[PDB]
Amino acid sequence: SKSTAEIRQAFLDFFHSKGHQVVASSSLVPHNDPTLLFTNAGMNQFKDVFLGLDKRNYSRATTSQRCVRAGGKHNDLENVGYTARHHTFFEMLGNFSFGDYFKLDAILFAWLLLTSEKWFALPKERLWVTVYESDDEAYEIWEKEVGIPRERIIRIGDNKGAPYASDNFWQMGDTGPCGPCTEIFYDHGDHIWGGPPGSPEEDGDRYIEIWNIVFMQFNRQADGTMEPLPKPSVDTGMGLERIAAVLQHVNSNYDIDLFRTLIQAVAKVTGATDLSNKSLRVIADHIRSCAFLIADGVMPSNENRGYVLRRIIRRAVRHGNMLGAKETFFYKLVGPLIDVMGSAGEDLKRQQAQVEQVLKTEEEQFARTLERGLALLDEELAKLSGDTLDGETAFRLYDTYGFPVDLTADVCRERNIKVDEAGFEAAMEEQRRRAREASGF
Ligand SMILES: Nc1ncnc2c1ncn2[C@@H]1O[C@H](COS(=O)(=O)NC(=O)[C@@H](N)CO)[C@@H](O)[C@H]1O
């Protein structure tokens, strides 16, 4: 089968052959978008084009965009290691129409690449589609233009409990370009638990969302109102790792060539032998987001972007501890990562030594309190009555040992114990008040 690198290139070659300008992935860190934490979609760098504020010399484009979804509007951090399909760092394969073509041709391009004998040649019978309930045009296109049997065309409304809150209405953020969308799912088969989209078991890893095609129509305002974009446009995105799994005849993202190699490297540096332990997958995921974020300029800190990076590094180190890592290990995975990323790792390779030192320093710094804090947590859990760790203890781990609350929650979750988040926040607020009282005016 095709390697991840070959699939990435084949996607771009397809759209290039269809007249799309190949554009380089943007950084994970925007210089000119105050509303955006980290790049979470291929469309981010074209935001102003969709808004009609910027015009390029091309009206259609294609990219393989590095994305991190670990905060802000789209955050999958807590899914990592619990599903076969979610990462913090991933590549989104995208095509874009800036007032060029619209619904029918967007859908045809996608179907052609996926199912043509000349291209990916996926079995059509295993593909399902969803449309926004009110999108009668998208429904008709799939039904009559493409020819998907009606039983595999699913209408989804505002299933997230609010107007425009839907798996089939995509929003860049609380503000920004958005619109109704249609998604393509691949059925991995009955050896995996799960039901089709719209079903009670839709959240399973059996029917995987491969490609989202967004019909950009509005700019969302902070108050929740929708202002029409000047020109209806197209924003699509397919997870490289998810389509690689399909094409490589495996079920999990972590079974593709890229992750198999990377997970072997994690086992090597941690001393783990069981290649099925979920901590190996978590660390493999985390090195991707951490290394690339540092390459794109993020430095560990206790505020904003730096704190998200710090949180992910420390969670990765903690997982290494659970695996029994005896020495500093996380920075050792930068080399192996560069080796599996191909051309998509160019920016990381360029700054290898720098990224390695940042990761090494951060792990060494955390090791000053990691084992001691875990010892305290074990002590508190051993005598804990109930299913919830008190907020005072969570705050003590934070304040004394530098444990972000989500790191503590992650450890506790592995033992079916919850964390009293309201209690943690109450403790933080109490300390804030003490700081105000002491500092004065
Ligand atoms: N956390 C994640 N891990 C791995 N793959 C993901 C993750 N989030 C999204 N994807 C993949 O990226 C595709 C596009 O993401 S999307 O949120 O659904 N859609 C968008 O971002 C829109 N901008 C359309 O491009 C998804 O269909 C899925 O295949």
Side-chain angles (χ1 to χ4, degrees):
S1 55
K2 283 192 177 64
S3 68
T4 294
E6 286 171 334
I7 295 164
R8 183 192 298 113
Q9 187 63 48
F11 176 94
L12 296 166
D13 285 347
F14 175 86
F15 283 103
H16 177 76
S17 80
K18 305 300 184 182
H20 292 66
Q21 175 75 45
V22 178
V23 179
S25 178
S26 72
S27 173
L28 290 167
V29 183
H31 185 84
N32 292 300
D33 193 344
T35 72
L36 186 63
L37 180 74
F38 303 125
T39 303
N40 57 24
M43 63 72 52
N44 291 171
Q45 69 169 317
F46 304 113
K47 179 184 184 184
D48 287 352
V49 185
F50 287 111
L51 293 172
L53 298 170
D54 178 32
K55 195 172 185 175
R56 309 297 178 87
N57 291 339
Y58 44 89
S59 57
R60 53 172 76 181
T62 185
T63 72
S64 179
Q65 177 63 51
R66 62 170 167 278
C67 303
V68 166
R69 286 187 174 197
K73 183 77 163 185
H74 304 283
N75 181 356
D76 290 302
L77 175 60
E78 304 305 341
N79 288 320
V80 174
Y82 289 96
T83 80
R85 73 186 186 271
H86 289 105
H87 306 303
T88 50
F89 175 100
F90 69 100
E91 284 178 84
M92 186 180 299
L93 305 169
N95 66 283
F96 311 93
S97 171
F98 311 120
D100 193 322
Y101 56 88
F102 202 39
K103 292 191 180 173
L104 177 48
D105 285 304
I107 287 170
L108 296 179
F109 278 142
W111 191 248
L112 189 68
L113 174 62
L114 291 188
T115 68
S116 172
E117 66 179 356
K118 303 182 184 180
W119 302 99
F120 290 168
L122 297 190
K124 293 178 182 176
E125 65 270 21
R126 302 184 83 175
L127 293 163
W128 294 63
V129 296
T130 59
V131 299
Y132 199 39
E133 184 175 329
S134 60
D135 198 344
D136 292 333
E137 291 163 5
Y139 188 99
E140 185 276 338
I141 290 161
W142 283 119
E143 186 195 12
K144 297 178 177 182
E145 303 296 333
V146 173
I148 310 294
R150 289 177 64 103
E151 57 264 33
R152 296 205 306 275
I153 309 176
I154 302 162
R155 293 191 185 252
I156 304 288
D158 291 333
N159 67 314
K160 291 163 71 180
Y164 295 118
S166 170
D167 288 325
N168 285 76
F169 191 95
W170 194 82
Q171 297 173 16
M172 173 174 171
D174 288 333
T175 63
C178 60
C181 62
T182 178
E183 306 193 312
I184 307 171
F185 291 75
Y186 182 83
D187 178 14
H188 279 268
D190 59 6
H191 52 289
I192 308 295
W193 186 93
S199 76
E201 300 184 347
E202 66 170 4
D203 193 47
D205 280 323
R206 178 177 171 171
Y207 299 82
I208 297 292
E209 180 186 313
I210 300 294
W211 203 339
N212 188 24
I213 300 163
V214 180
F215 311 122
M216 285 292 188
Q217 286 285 19
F218 309 101
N219 176 32
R220 193 180 189 270
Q221 310 296 304
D223 55 23
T225 57
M226 299 290 181
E227 301 182 5
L229 300 175
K231 299 182 176 189
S233 295
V234 182
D235 154 34
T236 92
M238 165 159 61
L240 172 55
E241 301 81 3
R242 292 181 188 190
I243 189 61
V246 173
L247 287 169
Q248 291 178 12
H249 312 280
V250 297
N251 299 134
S252 174
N253 286 15
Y254 295 101
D255 283 327
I256 74 185
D257 56 343
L258 190 154
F259 274 113
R260 281 186 177 181
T261 300
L262 194 50
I263 286 164
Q264 288 170 346
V266 176
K268 179 171 171 288
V269 304
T270 58
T273 54
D274 180 10
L275 296 173
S276 73
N277 188 308
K278 81 163 191 174
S279 281
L280 292 171
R281 300 193 292 277
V282 174
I283 294 166
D285 171 81
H286 285 14
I287 188 65
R288 303 220 300 168
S289 48
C290 293
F292 276 94
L293 285 168
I294 301 166
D296 286 345
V298 189
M299 289 295 296
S301 80
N302 289 329
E303 298 88 8
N304 300 305
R305 288 182 182 111
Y307 191 51
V308 181
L309 173 64
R310 168 159 286 164
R311 288 196 295 105
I312 304 175
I313 292 165
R314 296 195 173 196
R315 283 171 67 154
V317 171
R318 204 286 297 183
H319 278 273
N321 165 284
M322 195 190 183
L323 289 175
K326 273 83 185 298
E327 48 190 342
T328 315
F329 78 89
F330 197 50
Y331 77 95
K332 296 180 181 180
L333 293 167
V334 174
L337 176 59
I338 290 163
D339 287 349
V340 302
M341 286 304 298
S343 59
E346 282 171 8
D347 289 322
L348 176 56
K349 184 181 183 68
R350 174 169 50 80
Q351 288 171 108
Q352 178 168 6
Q354 183 175 4
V355 174
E356 283 166 345
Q357 188 52 249
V358 172
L359 291 173
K360 185 168 182 286
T361 295
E362 181 66 26
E363 180 171 351
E364 284 162 356
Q365 172 66 19
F366 188 37
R368 298 170 70 184
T369 55
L370 175 53
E371 287 195 349
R372 296 189 292 169
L374 289 180
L376 172 62
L377 180 53
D378 283 345
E379 159 195 320
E380 297 294 321
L381 288 173
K383 63 179 183 184
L384 179 62
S385 178
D387 66 349
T388 303
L389 184 73
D390 55 289
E392 180 172 337
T393 296
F395 185 73
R396 182 165 295 109
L397 287 159
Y398 168 87
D399 183 70
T400 297
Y401 302 86
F403 280 36
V405 67
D406 60 297
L407 184 154
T408 297
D410 186 48
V411 182
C412 289
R413 192 163 290 105
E414 294 176 346
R415 310 179 190 187
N416 297 306
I417 300 292
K418 305 168 190 175
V419 172
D420 182 3
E421 295 289 343
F424 172 81
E425 297 180 13
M428 185 171 73
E429 176 61 20
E430 284 157 8
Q431 191 186 59
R432 191 199 72 93
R433 292 298 292 270
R434 293 193 291 273
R436 285 187 96 259
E437 175 67 12
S439 56
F441 178 59

